[PDB]
Design a protein around this ligand. Structure first.
Ligand SMILES: C#CCNC(=O)[C@H](CNC(=O)[C@H](CNC(=O)CNC(=O)c1cccc(O)c1O)NC(=O)c1cccc(O)c1O)NC(=O)c1cccc(O)c1O
Ligand SMILES: [Fe+3]
Length: 267
């Protein structure tokens, strides 16, 4: 419903400069703009570490000047906000499709919330690998062993799908207020076999949830607590759950992103 925040983009007085890289989905239906924030600092020998953010029209709006100045500590990351070509802060249709996994059973697969087409998670993650990273790498040197993937809500659902089904693409996975309720907890089933799929890899998972969030949009915290308890047991996986006192669902997006970017950079 609301406009995105372009102010940051056209600014010049910070230690980051932002440029756009455009791509379409393979099926031609969805239209992306990746906003690349490049440190003024020269790349490390092995390339910049990279932080990929879903809901990027929104994520750019949540990159504050204070955070951006501190990120320039001599090992600054490349920031890649994966947005949609639209004025809006949020792209309902695109994001609903791109960030939800397929539910094998269903023919026309439709979001149980807003009824839009869903189930494009794997196509999206494939496009990240096969089209986005190629384009981003051409603009700046990347350290592909030091990559972070962040998302909020359905974006967090996506992030969990990536870790659970295709672990090791990213070093750090960061899921804020992941929509665990989706399809009566369907994402929770995808976690079966994770330890086996993680063999020979090490990965970090950061989770957030706000104290004021309901269990779904229509027993708060139970699902998350059980997921955390389970994942704590997984060899190779470092888990950090951070509850956010005083926040509801919408507000955890910005909070998680600011807190993520304040963390130590990935090894
Ligand atoms: C328009 C649009 C698409 N974007 C959003 O809805 C985002 C991010 N939300 C999500 O990605 C999903 C998916 N949301 C949508 O696709 C659009 N929302 C709705 O259709 C909706 C329907 C019934 C009740 C709701 O609260 C809804 O948001 N929401 C949830 O998982 C959710 C979880 C706990 C509590 C909630 O209120 C949640 O919304 N939500 C917000 O920014 C938000 C802001 C203030 C208050 C809110 O409740 C918000 O959801
Ligand atoms: Fe909501």
């Amino acid at each position: 419903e609301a406009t995105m925040d372009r102010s940051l983009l056209q600014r010049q007085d910070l230690p980051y400069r932002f440029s756009a890289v455009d791509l379409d989905s393979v099926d031609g239906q969805r239209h992306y703009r990746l906003w690349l924030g490049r440190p003024l600092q020269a790349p490390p020998a092995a390339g910049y570490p990279v932080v990929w953010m879903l809901d990027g029209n929104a994520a750019v709006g949540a990159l504050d000047e204070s955070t951006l100045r501190r990120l320039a500590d001599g090992d600054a990351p490349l920031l890649v906000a994966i947005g949609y070509r639209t004025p809006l802060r949020i792209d309902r249709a695109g994001r609903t499709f791109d960030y939800t996994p397929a539910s094998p059973g269903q023919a026309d697969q439709r979001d149980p919330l807003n009824g839009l087409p869903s189930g494009g998670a794997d196509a999206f993650l494939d496009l990240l690998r096969d089209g986005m990273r190629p384009a981003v790498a051409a603009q700046a040197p990347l350290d592909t062993a030091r990559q972070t993937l962040w998302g909020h809500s359905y974006g967090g659902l996506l992030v969990l799908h990536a870790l659970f089904t295709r672990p090791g693409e990213f070093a750090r996975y960061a899921a804020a207020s992941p929509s665990l309720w989706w399809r009566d907890g369907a994402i929770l089933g995808e976690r079966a076999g994770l330890e086996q799929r993680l063999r020979g890899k090490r990965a970090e998972l950061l989770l957030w949830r706000g104290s004021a969030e309901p269990a779904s949009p229509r027993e708060p915290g139970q699902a998350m607590a059980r997921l955390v308890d389970d994942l704590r047991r997984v060899a190779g996986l470092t888990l950090d759950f951070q509850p956010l006192d005083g926040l509801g669902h919408g507000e955890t997006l910005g909070a998680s992103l600011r807190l993520l970017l304040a963390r130590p950079a990935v090894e």
